[PDB]
Amino acid sequence: PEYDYLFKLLLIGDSGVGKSCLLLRFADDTYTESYISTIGVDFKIRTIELDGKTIKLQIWDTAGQERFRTITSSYYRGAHGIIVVYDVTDQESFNNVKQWLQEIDRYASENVNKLLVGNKCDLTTKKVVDYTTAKEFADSLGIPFLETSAKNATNVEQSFMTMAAEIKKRM
Amino acid sequence: EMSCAEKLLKVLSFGLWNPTYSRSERQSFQELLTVLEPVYPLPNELGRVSARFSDGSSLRISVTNSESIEAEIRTPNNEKITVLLESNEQNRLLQSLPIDRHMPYIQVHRALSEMDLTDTTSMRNLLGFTSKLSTTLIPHNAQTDPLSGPTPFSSIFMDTCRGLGNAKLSLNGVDIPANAQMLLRDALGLKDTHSSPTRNVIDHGISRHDAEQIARESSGSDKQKAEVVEFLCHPEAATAICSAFYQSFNVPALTLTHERISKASEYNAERSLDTPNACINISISQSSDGNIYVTSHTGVLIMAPEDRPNEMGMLTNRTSYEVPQGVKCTIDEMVRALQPRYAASETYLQN
Amino acid sequence: MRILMLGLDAAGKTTILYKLKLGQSVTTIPTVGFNVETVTYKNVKFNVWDVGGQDKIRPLWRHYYTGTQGLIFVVDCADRDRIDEARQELHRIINDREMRDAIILIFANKQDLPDAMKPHEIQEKLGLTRIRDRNWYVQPSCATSGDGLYEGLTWLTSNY
Numbered sequence A: 001p002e003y004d005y006l007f008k009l010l011l012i013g014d015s016g017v018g019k020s021c022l023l024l025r026f027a028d029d030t031y032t033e034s035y036i037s038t039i040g041v042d043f044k045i046r047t048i049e050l051d052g053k054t055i056k057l058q059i060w061d062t063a064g065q066e067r068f069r070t071i072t073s074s075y076y077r078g079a080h081g082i083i084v085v086y087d088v089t090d091q092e093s094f095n096n097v098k099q100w101l102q103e104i105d106r107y108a109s110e111n112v113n114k115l116l117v118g119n120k121c122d123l124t125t126k127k128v129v130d131y132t133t134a135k136e137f138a139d140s141l142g143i144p145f146l147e148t149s150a151k152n153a154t155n156v157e158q159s160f161m162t163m164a165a166e167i168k169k170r171m
Numbered sequence B: 001e002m003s004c005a006e007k008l009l010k011v012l013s014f015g016l017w018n019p020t021y022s023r024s025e026r027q028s029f030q031e032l033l034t035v036l037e038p039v040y041p042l043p044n045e046l047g048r049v050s051a052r053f054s055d056g057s058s059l060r061i062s063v064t065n066s067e068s069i070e071a072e073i074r075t076p077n078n079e080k081i082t083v084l085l086e087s088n089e090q091n092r093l094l095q096s097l098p099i100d101r102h103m104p105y106i107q108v109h110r111a112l113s114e115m116d117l118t119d120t121t122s123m124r125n126l127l128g129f130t131s132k133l134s135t136t137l138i139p140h141n142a143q144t145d146p147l148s149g150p151t152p153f154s155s156i157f158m159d160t161c162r163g164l165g166n167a168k169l170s171l172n173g174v175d176i177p178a179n180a181q182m183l184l185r186d187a188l189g190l191k192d193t194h195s196s197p198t199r200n201v202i203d204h205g206i207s208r209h210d211a212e213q214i215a216r217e218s219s220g221s222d223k224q225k226a227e228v229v230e231f232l233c234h235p236e237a238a239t240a241i242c243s244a245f246y247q248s249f250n251v252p253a254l255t256l257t258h259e260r261i262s263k264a265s266e267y268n269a270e271r272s273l274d275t276p277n278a279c280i281n282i283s284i285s286q287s288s289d290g291n292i293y294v295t296s297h298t299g300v301l302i303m304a305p306e307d308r309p310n311e312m313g314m315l316t317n318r319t320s321y322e323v324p325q326g327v328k329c330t331i332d333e334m335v336r337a338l339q340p341r342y343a344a345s346e347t348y349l350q351n
Numbered sequence C: 001m002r003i004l005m006l007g008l009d010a011a012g013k014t015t016i017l018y019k020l021k022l023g024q025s026v027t028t029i030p031t032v033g034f035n036v037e038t039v040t041y042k043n044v045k046f047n048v049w050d051v052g053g054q055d056k057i058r059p060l061w062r063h064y065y066t067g068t069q070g071l072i073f074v075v076d077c078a079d080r081d082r083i084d085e086a087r088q089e090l091h092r093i094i095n096d097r098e099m100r101d102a103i104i105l106i107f108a109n110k111q112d113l114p115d116a117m118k119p120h121e122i123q124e125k126l127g128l129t130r131i132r133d134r135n136w137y138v139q140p141s142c143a144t145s146g147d148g149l150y151e152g153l154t155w156l157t158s159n160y
């Protein structure tokens, strides 16, 4: 055991709102559309250093299409965190953020660290969700909401480590 | 002077998997098998395959439900040659053919001589092959049907943006390179992952302008190119291309081996095997009759069963269907009209 | 020997039938019709007839009773919620005069799962213990590997 921690993070949310772009920029510091839509569940790793501890990570990515709902449930089990990502430019993806939270209750552990994220903020011209509108539902439930972007790398490192610490609290 | 088509048919008849091949020859075969494109099968058929080689020859293999394999060829001097074939446990013929069959279990295939799994390129090179092999028709219930539920064919458009230019496309044997796809992605009015095809592109298909271009930037004889143009001009064609990229077509098969699929993801995340999530290999052909057949099989690395440890392979979830003459590229019609057949197959490296 | 494989759905019948015919394990698919293969173990040929166990095609099991030399009732040692539903069908099977006389081999499949149910337990659960005047056995097995699958065969052989 060369690592001090083993955490498993799951990324759920509407399909098309950058759950992969946020998983690649955080694991590989890159961004491109040369990749095809994720089919099922993807698995990446990125070890960090916080509080002088080897925090090895095991991020699990999942599709968004309603059909992949039944198949994704078999992953909410040993989840130490759940980053319900939503597109801040697509109103639809903002409403469903509530539904993805429900799925979490039915399947993920009662004490799962819920971390909200509004990705794709660079395109402010075509944005629809005010930092206040979202933060409202977020702070209403104790969800550390942060606006990020996998393109500008805004809060990509920040909004991600937030879970790495929020989890170290229960341990 | 054995015609190109005659070669392939001869090989497949003796056994594409025959270990006696000096490997040097395996290369000689891969180049032909990848030219086989599944097309609209006749009523009493279980699968039809066509291929237009460079020597002007052509091959047409049919497979009745009685698993009867009839084949027809046409040498450069148009010499219609019909040859009845037979498949035995020796040549595994009925295996080296892109045809979904009724099997009690997911079909298992073995790659060829060198095919190895390492980088993005090594993945596509494999899928190019497996997609030309048989599969196992997987049933689907209303709960796992890619066309049921609340939002059917919802991401069909966005699934194409991040799809085109990164997939192995084929329109009547005419390979559609990267730049080619990116050109189509434009004519389809699919800019951002939130836009939808222009109202005009739906009623009239791809403008004769963009369409004609895509052809020029595609591998194929001048004669062939022209065809791709007449195809990319009908409103139906749009519905056929945007649908083939659907992401949920994998649900039917995934819900069968999604467990072993993740085990493969783990063995890679740790091994730092630089390999993308999945790969798409599409094959769209329009018979002279007018029918439009779309075959889109997706590739995904999967871990072999329990008995065979530490042996990785690739699952090929195939999805074939027809495009009714009239179905326009709209999230709605696509769901009411189309009836896709889902079938996958596991392929493991030769190690 | 004409063997007839039966049991609740998702019990692991096809997984077994084709586990012997191939040796290697395969990703079985919901049987809607009926799989019939021929395996030869212990210098003896077996004629297995795997019939679907869907709640729908359950009644078509009688169309296979006649001409049955043996009954291989596969049972999911973990699906306790339907473990009883098993004895329900099992009894209804071994009673009908058609198969009133044949050896009966009960497979305790899925012994690898945590909630595994010991054989002697399935024996009293299915209601095989109280019922005598007949030949049977409860063989522990795991289709995903092959444990007991072959011994269960050697059983049919020695007991006939």
Ligand SMILES: Nc1nc2c(ncn2[C@@H]2O[C@H](COP(=O)(O)OP(=O)(O)OP(=O)(O)O)[C@@H](O)[C@H]2O)c(=O)[nH]1
Residues within 6 Å of the ligand: C007, C008, C009, C010, C011, C012, C013, C014, C015, C016, C027, C028, C029, C030, C031, C032, C051, C052, C053, C054, C109, C110, C111, C112, C113, C141, C142, C143, C144
């Ligand atoms: N975990 C586990 N799964 C098993 C075991 N044996 C079989 N299975 C799985 O059980 C599932 C169903 O197997 P089948 O043989 O198709 O079930 P069946 O009852 O024959 O199917 P129908 O006859 O169509 O109802 C498959 O996923 C098998 O791989 C086992 O020992 N352990």
Ligand SMILES: Nc1nc2c(ncn2[C@@H]2O[C@H](COP(=O)(O)OP(=O)(O)O)[C@@H](O)[C@H]2O)c(=O)[nH]1
Residues within 6 Å of the ligand: A013, A014, A015, A016, A017, A018, A019, A020, A021, A033, A037, A038, A064, A119, A120, A121, A122, A123, A149, A150, A151, A152, B161, B162, B192, B193
């Ligand atoms: N402009 C912009 N686009 C983004 C950003 N993040 C994601 N996207 C879009 O989302 C697509 C890929 O996101 P994706 O991973 O497929 O979403 P997912 O499938 O739900 O994980 C790309 O084609 C981008 O156009 C961003 O920060 N800026």
Ligand SMILES: [Mg+2]
Residues within 6 Å of the ligand: A019, A020, A037, A038, A061, A062, A063
């Ligand atoms: Mg994804």
Ligand SMILES: [Mg+2]
Residues within 6 Å of the ligand: C013, C014, C015, C028, C029, C030, C031, C050, C051, C052, C053
């Ligand atoms: Mg079965």
